[PDB]
Short mmCIF file of all heavy atoms in Angstrom, two decimals:
data_model
loop_
_atom_site.label_atom_id
_atom_site.label_comp_id
_atom_site.label_asym_id
_atom_site.label_seq_id
_atom_site.Cartn_x
_atom_site.Cartn_y
_atom_site.Cartn_z
N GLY A 3 0.79 -1.21 0.00
CA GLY A 3 0.00 0.00 0.00
C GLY A 3 0.83 1.27 0.00
O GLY A 3 0.44 2.31 0.53
N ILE A 4 2.00 1.26 -0.61
CA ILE A 4 2.76 2.48 -0.83
C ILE A 4 2.86 2.78 -2.32
O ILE A 4 2.53 1.97 -3.17
CB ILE A 4 4.18 2.33 -0.24
CG1 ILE A 4 4.97 1.22 -0.95
CG2 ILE A 4 4.09 2.15 1.25
CD1 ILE A 4 6.35 1.00 -0.37
N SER A 5 3.37 3.96 -2.63
CA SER A 5 3.56 4.29 -4.03
C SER A 5 4.77 3.59 -4.62
O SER A 5 5.62 3.16 -3.85
CB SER A 5 3.72 5.81 -4.16
OG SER A 5 4.98 6.21 -3.66
N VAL A 6 4.83 3.46 -5.94
CA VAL A 6 6.01 2.91 -6.56
C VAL A 6 7.22 3.74 -6.17
O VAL A 6 8.27 3.22 -5.79
CB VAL A 6 5.86 2.83 -8.09
CG1 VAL A 6 7.17 2.38 -8.71
CG2 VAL A 6 4.73 1.90 -8.53
N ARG A 7 7.13 5.07 -6.22
CA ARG A 7 8.30 5.90 -5.94
C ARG A 7 8.75 5.72 -4.50
O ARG A 7 9.96 5.80 -4.25
CB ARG A 7 8.05 7.38 -6.22
CG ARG A 7 9.20 8.30 -5.87
CD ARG A 7 8.95 9.71 -6.38
NE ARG A 7 9.16 9.76 -7.83
CZ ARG A 7 10.40 9.86 -8.32
NH1 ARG A 7 11.50 9.93 -7.58
NH2 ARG A 7 10.56 9.91 -9.61
N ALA A 8 7.81 5.48 -3.60
CA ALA A 8 8.18 5.26 -2.21
C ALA A 8 9.05 4.03 -2.04
O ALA A 8 9.81 3.89 -1.06
CB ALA A 8 6.91 5.13 -1.37
N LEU A 9 9.00 3.08 -2.98
CA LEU A 9 9.88 1.91 -2.85
C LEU A 9 11.27 2.13 -3.39
O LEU A 9 12.17 1.29 -3.20
CB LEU A 9 9.18 0.71 -3.51
CG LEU A 9 9.80 -0.68 -3.38
CD1 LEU A 9 9.96 -1.04 -1.91
CD2 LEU A 9 8.99 -1.71 -4.12
N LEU A 10 11.52 3.26 -4.07
CA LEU A 10 12.84 3.45 -4.66
C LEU A 10 13.90 3.73 -3.60
O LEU A 10 13.75 4.61 -2.76
CB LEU A 10 12.89 4.64 -5.62
CG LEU A 10 12.19 4.51 -6.95
CD1 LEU A 10 12.19 5.87 -7.66
CD2 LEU A 10 12.86 3.44 -7.82
N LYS A 11 14.99 2.99 -3.68
CA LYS A 11 16.17 3.27 -2.88
C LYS A 11 17.00 4.39 -3.50
O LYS A 11 17.38 4.31 -4.66
CB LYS A 11 16.98 1.99 -2.80
CG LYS A 11 18.34 2.10 -2.18
CD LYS A 11 18.44 1.75 -0.74
CE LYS A 11 19.91 1.98 -0.33
NZ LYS A 11 20.01 3.24 0.41
N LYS A 12 17.26 5.42 -2.71
CA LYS A 12 18.11 6.52 -3.13
C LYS A 12 19.57 6.19 -2.88
O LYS A 12 19.97 5.16 -2.33
CB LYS A 12 17.69 7.77 -2.34
CG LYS A 12 16.19 8.05 -2.47
CD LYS A 12 15.88 9.39 -1.80
CE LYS A 12 14.42 9.74 -1.79
NZ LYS A 12 14.15 11.13 -1.28
N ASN A 13 20.49 7.03 -3.24
CA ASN A 13 21.91 6.96 -2.90
C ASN A 13 22.56 5.65 -3.37
O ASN A 13 23.45 5.13 -2.72
CB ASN A 13 22.18 7.16 -1.41
CG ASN A 13 23.65 7.45 -1.10
OD1 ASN A 13 24.41 8.05 -1.87
ND2 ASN A 13 24.07 7.03 0.10
N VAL A 14 22.10 5.22 -4.54
CA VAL A 14 22.69 4.10 -5.25
C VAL A 14 22.90 4.49 -6.72
O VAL A 14 22.22 5.37 -7.26
CB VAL A 14 21.91 2.79 -5.12
CG1 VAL A 14 21.84 2.33 -3.66
CG2 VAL A 14 20.52 2.91 -5.68
N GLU A 15 23.87 3.83 -7.35
CA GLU A 15 24.37 4.29 -8.65
C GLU A 15 23.29 4.47 -9.70
O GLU A 15 23.26 5.54 -10.30
CB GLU A 15 25.51 3.36 -9.10
CG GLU A 15 26.20 3.83 -10.36
CD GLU A 15 27.52 3.16 -10.64
OE1 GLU A 15 27.98 2.30 -9.86
OE2 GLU A 15 28.12 3.50 -11.69
N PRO A 16 22.42 3.51 -9.97
CA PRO A 16 21.38 3.75 -10.97
C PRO A 16 20.40 4.86 -10.60
O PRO A 16 19.90 5.57 -11.48
CB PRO A 16 20.67 2.40 -11.09
CG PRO A 16 21.08 1.62 -9.91
CD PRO A 16 22.39 2.13 -9.42
N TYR A 17 20.09 5.06 -9.33
CA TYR A 17 19.18 6.16 -8.93
C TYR A 17 19.75 7.50 -9.36
O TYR A 17 19.08 8.40 -9.87
CB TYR A 17 18.93 6.09 -7.43
CG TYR A 17 17.92 7.06 -6.92
CD1 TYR A 17 16.60 6.70 -6.80
CD2 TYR A 17 18.27 8.37 -6.57
CE1 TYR A 17 15.63 7.58 -6.34
CE2 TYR A 17 17.31 9.25 -6.10
CZ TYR A 17 15.99 8.87 -5.99
OH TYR A 17 15.06 9.78 -5.53
N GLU A 18 21.05 7.63 -9.10
CA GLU A 18 21.81 8.82 -9.46
C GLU A 18 21.87 8.98 -10.98
O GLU A 18 21.51 10.05 -11.50
CB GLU A 18 23.21 8.75 -8.86
CG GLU A 18 23.29 8.44 -7.38
CD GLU A 18 22.74 9.49 -6.46
OE1 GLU A 18 22.30 10.54 -6.97
OE2 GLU A 18 22.78 9.25 -5.23
N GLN A 19 22.37 7.97 -11.67
CA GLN A 19 22.75 8.08 -13.06
C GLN A 19 21.55 8.10 -14.00
O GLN A 19 21.63 8.71 -15.07
CB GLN A 19 23.69 6.95 -13.49
CG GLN A 19 25.02 7.05 -12.74
CD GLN A 19 26.01 5.97 -13.10
OE1 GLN A 19 25.62 4.95 -13.66
NE2 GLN A 19 27.30 6.16 -12.83
N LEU A 20 20.48 7.45 -13.56
CA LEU A 20 19.23 7.50 -14.30
C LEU A 20 18.38 8.73 -13.96
O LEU A 20 17.32 8.96 -14.56
CB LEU A 20 18.41 6.22 -14.06
CG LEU A 20 19.07 4.94 -14.58
CD1 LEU A 20 18.39 3.71 -13.99
CD2 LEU A 20 19.08 4.98 -16.11
N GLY A 21 18.79 9.55 -13.01
CA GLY A 21 18.13 10.80 -12.68
C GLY A 21 16.77 10.66 -12.02
O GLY A 21 15.90 11.53 -12.19
N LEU A 22 16.61 9.58 -11.26
CA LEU A 22 15.29 9.17 -10.76
C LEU A 22 14.77 10.11 -9.68
O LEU A 22 13.57 10.06 -9.37
CB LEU A 22 15.27 7.71 -10.32
CG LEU A 22 15.67 6.66 -11.37
CD1 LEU A 22 15.43 5.23 -10.81
CD2 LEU A 22 14.97 6.82 -12.71
N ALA A 23 15.61 10.98 -9.13
CA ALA A 23 15.11 11.98 -8.22
C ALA A 23 14.09 12.90 -8.85
O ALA A 23 13.20 13.42 -8.16
CB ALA A 23 16.27 12.85 -7.69
N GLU A 24 14.24 13.12 -10.15
CA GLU A 24 13.39 14.06 -10.87
C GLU A 24 12.03 13.41 -11.13
O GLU A 24 11.93 12.21 -11.42
CB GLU A 24 13.97 14.46 -12.21
CG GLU A 24 15.29 15.20 -12.26
CD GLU A 24 15.56 15.46 -13.76
OE1 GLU A 24 14.76 16.23 -14.31
OE2 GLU A 24 16.50 14.83 -14.28
N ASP A 25 10.99 14.22 -11.06
CA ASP A 25 9.62 13.71 -11.31
C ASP A 25 9.28 13.67 -12.78
O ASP A 25 8.49 14.48 -13.29
CB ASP A 25 8.62 14.56 -10.53
CG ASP A 25 7.21 14.07 -10.64
OD1 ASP A 25 7.03 12.88 -11.00
OD2 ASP A 25 6.30 14.87 -10.37
N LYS A 26 9.87 12.72 -13.49
CA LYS A 26 9.77 12.62 -14.93
C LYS A 26 9.49 11.18 -15.35
O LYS A 26 9.70 10.87 -16.51
CB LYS A 26 11.06 13.09 -15.64
CG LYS A 26 11.36 14.56 -15.50
CD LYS A 26 12.54 15.05 -16.30
CE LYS A 26 13.44 13.99 -16.87
NZ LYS A 26 14.53 14.59 -17.73
N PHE A 27 9.05 10.36 -14.41
CA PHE A 27 8.91 8.93 -14.66
C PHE A 27 7.55 8.42 -14.26
O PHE A 27 7.08 8.74 -13.15
CB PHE A 27 9.97 8.16 -13.85
CG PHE A 27 11.36 8.67 -14.20
CD1 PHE A 27 11.97 9.63 -13.41
CD2 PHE A 27 12.05 8.18 -15.28
CE1 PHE A 27 13.22 10.10 -13.73
CE2 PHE A 27 13.30 8.66 -15.64
CZ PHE A 27 13.87 9.63 -14.85
N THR A 28 6.89 7.66 -15.10
CA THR A 28 5.62 7.05 -14.70
C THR A 28 5.88 5.90 -13.73
O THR A 28 6.99 5.42 -13.61
CB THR A 28 4.81 6.49 -15.86
OG1 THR A 28 5.60 5.50 -16.49
CG2 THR A 28 4.58 7.47 -17.00
N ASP A 29 4.82 5.46 -13.05
CA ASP A 29 5.03 4.30 -12.19
C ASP A 29 5.58 3.10 -12.91
O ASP A 29 6.47 2.40 -12.36
CB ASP A 29 3.68 3.98 -11.55
CG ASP A 29 3.33 4.89 -10.40
OD1 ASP A 29 4.15 5.75 -10.04
OD2 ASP A 29 2.22 4.71 -9.87
N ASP A 30 5.12 2.82 -14.13
CA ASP A 30 5.63 1.59 -14.77
C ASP A 30 7.06 1.73 -15.24
O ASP A 30 7.84 0.80 -15.28
CB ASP A 30 4.72 1.17 -15.94
CG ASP A 30 3.47 0.54 -15.36
OD1 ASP A 30 3.60 -0.62 -14.94
OD2 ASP A 30 2.41 1.19 -15.31
N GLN A 31 7.60 2.85 -15.65
CA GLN A 31 8.94 3.22 -15.97
C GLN A 31 9.73 2.90 -14.69
O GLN A 31 10.75 2.22 -14.81
CB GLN A 31 9.13 4.67 -16.42
CG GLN A 31 8.61 4.93 -17.81
CD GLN A 31 8.61 6.38 -18.28
OE1 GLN A 31 8.45 7.35 -17.50
NE2 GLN A 31 8.84 6.57 -19.59
N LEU A 32 9.24 3.35 -13.54
CA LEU A 32 9.97 3.08 -12.28
C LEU A 32 10.01 1.59 -11.96
O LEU A 32 11.07 1.08 -11.56
CB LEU A 32 9.41 3.91 -11.13
CG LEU A 32 9.58 5.42 -11.27
CD1 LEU A 32 8.93 6.10 -10.08
CD2 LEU A 32 11.03 5.83 -11.44
N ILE A 33 8.88 0.91 -12.14
CA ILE A 33 8.84 -0.54 -11.91
C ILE A 33 9.89 -1.24 -12.80
O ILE A 33 10.67 -2.09 -12.38
CB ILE A 33 7.45 -1.12 -12.14
CG1 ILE A 33 6.45 -0.71 -11.06
CG2 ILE A 33 7.43 -2.64 -12.26
CD1 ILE A 33 5.03 -0.98 -11.44
N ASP A 34 9.96 -0.88 -14.06
CA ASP A 34 10.92 -1.52 -14.98
C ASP A 34 12.35 -1.16 -14.59
O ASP A 34 13.19 -2.05 -14.74
CB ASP A 34 10.55 -1.18 -16.44
CG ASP A 34 9.31 -1.98 -16.82
OD1 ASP A 34 9.34 -3.23 -16.66
OD2 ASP A 34 8.32 -1.38 -17.28
N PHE A 35 12.64 0.04 -14.12
CA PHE A 35 13.97 0.33 -13.60
C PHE A 35 14.30 -0.59 -12.43
O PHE A 35 15.39 -1.10 -12.40
CB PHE A 35 14.13 1.79 -13.17
CG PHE A 35 14.29 2.72 -14.37
CD1 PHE A 35 13.51 3.84 -14.52
CD2 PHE A 35 15.21 2.46 -15.36
CE1 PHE A 35 13.65 4.71 -15.57
CE2 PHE A 35 15.35 3.33 -16.43
CZ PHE A 35 14.56 4.47 -16.57
N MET A 36 13.37 -0.79 -11.49
CA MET A 36 13.65 -1.66 -10.35
C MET A 36 13.94 -3.08 -10.80
O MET A 36 14.83 -3.75 -10.26
CB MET A 36 12.44 -1.75 -9.40
CG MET A 36 12.25 -0.46 -8.62
SD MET A 36 10.75 -0.61 -7.63
CE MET A 36 10.71 1.05 -6.95
N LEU A 37 13.20 -3.59 -11.78
CA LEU A 37 13.46 -4.96 -12.25
C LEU A 37 14.81 -5.12 -12.93
O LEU A 37 15.45 -6.17 -12.81
CB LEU A 37 12.39 -5.39 -13.23
CG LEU A 37 10.98 -5.52 -12.68
CD1 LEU A 37 9.99 -5.73 -13.81
CD2 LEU A 37 10.90 -6.70 -11.73
N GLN A 38 15.23 -4.08 -13.68
CA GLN A 38 16.49 -4.10 -14.39
C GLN A 38 17.68 -3.74 -13.51
O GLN A 38 18.83 -4.03 -13.90
CB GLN A 38 16.42 -3.16 -15.59
CG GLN A 38 15.31 -3.60 -16.55
CD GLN A 38 15.40 -5.08 -16.89
OE1 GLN A 38 14.40 -5.83 -16.85
NE2 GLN A 38 16.59 -5.49 -17.23
N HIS A 39 17.42 -3.12 -12.37
CA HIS A 39 18.46 -2.65 -11.47
C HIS A 39 17.99 -2.87 -10.04
O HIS A 39 17.57 -1.97 -9.36
CB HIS A 39 18.82 -1.16 -11.67
CG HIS A 39 18.98 -0.76 -13.09
ND1 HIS A 39 20.14 -0.92 -13.79
CD2 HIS A 39 18.09 -0.27 -13.98
CE1 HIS A 39 19.98 -0.51 -15.06
NE2 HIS A 39 18.72 -0.10 -15.19
N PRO A 40 17.99 -4.11 -9.58
CA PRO A 40 17.33 -4.45 -8.31
C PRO A 40 17.86 -3.75 -7.06
O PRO A 40 17.19 -3.74 -6.02
CB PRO A 40 17.58 -5.97 -8.19
CG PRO A 40 17.96 -6.44 -9.53
CD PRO A 40 18.53 -5.29 -10.29
N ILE A 41 19.03 -3.12 -7.13
CA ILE A 41 19.52 -2.32 -6.00
C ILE A 41 18.58 -1.14 -5.74
O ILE A 41 18.56 -0.58 -4.64
CB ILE A 41 20.96 -1.85 -6.22
CG1 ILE A 41 21.60 -1.33 -4.92
CG2 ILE A 41 21.07 -0.83 -7.35
CD1 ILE A 41 23.05 -0.95 -5.06
N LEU A 42 17.75 -0.78 -6.71
CA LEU A 42 16.76 0.27 -6.57
C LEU A 42 15.57 -0.12 -5.71
O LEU A 42 14.78 0.72 -5.32
CB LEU A 42 16.23 0.67 -7.95
CG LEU A 42 17.12 1.47 -8.87
CD1 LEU A 42 16.42 1.64 -10.22
CD2 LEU A 42 17.49 2.82 -8.26
N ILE A 43 15.42 -1.39 -5.37
CA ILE A 43 14.26 -1.85 -4.58
C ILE A 43 14.60 -1.64 -3.13
O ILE A 43 15.56 -2.24 -2.64
CB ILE A 43 13.92 -3.32 -4.90
CG1 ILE A 43 13.57 -3.59 -6.36
CG2 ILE A 43 12.80 -3.78 -3.97
CD1 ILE A 43 13.54 -5.06 -6.74
N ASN A 44 13.88 -0.79 -2.41
CA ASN A 44 14.22 -0.59 -0.99
C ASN A 44 13.89 -1.87 -0.24
O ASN A 44 13.24 -2.78 -0.75
CB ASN A 44 13.57 0.65 -0.40
CG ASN A 44 14.42 1.34 0.64
OD1 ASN A 44 15.37 0.74 1.17
ND2 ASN A 44 14.09 2.60 0.92
#
């Protein structure tokens, strides 16, 4: 019962390099980033 963005782990290389701090990503874009870069899963 949280948002997709709430599950994102910050302060890891793909979060930084993919620019995920910025609000430019749909939930499914974020879901696919997490699957391709599992360090992003909090």
Side-chain angles (χ1 to χ4, degrees):
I4 64 182
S5 72
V6 174
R7 176 171 285 279
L9 187 57
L10 288 172
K11 172 96 182 103
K12 307 186 183 187
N13 195 31
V14 299
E15 186 165 359
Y17 186 94
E18 309 294 358
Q19 295 180 342
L20 297 165
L22 303 187
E24 297 181 65
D25 184 19
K26 293 186 346 177
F27 304 96
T28 60
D29 282 357
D30 284 283
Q31 287 173 329
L32 295 178
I33 290 166
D34 286 306
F35 284 129
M36 288 176 184
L37 295 171
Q38 300 310 133
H39 315 276
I41 195 176
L42 287 175
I43 300 167
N44 213 344

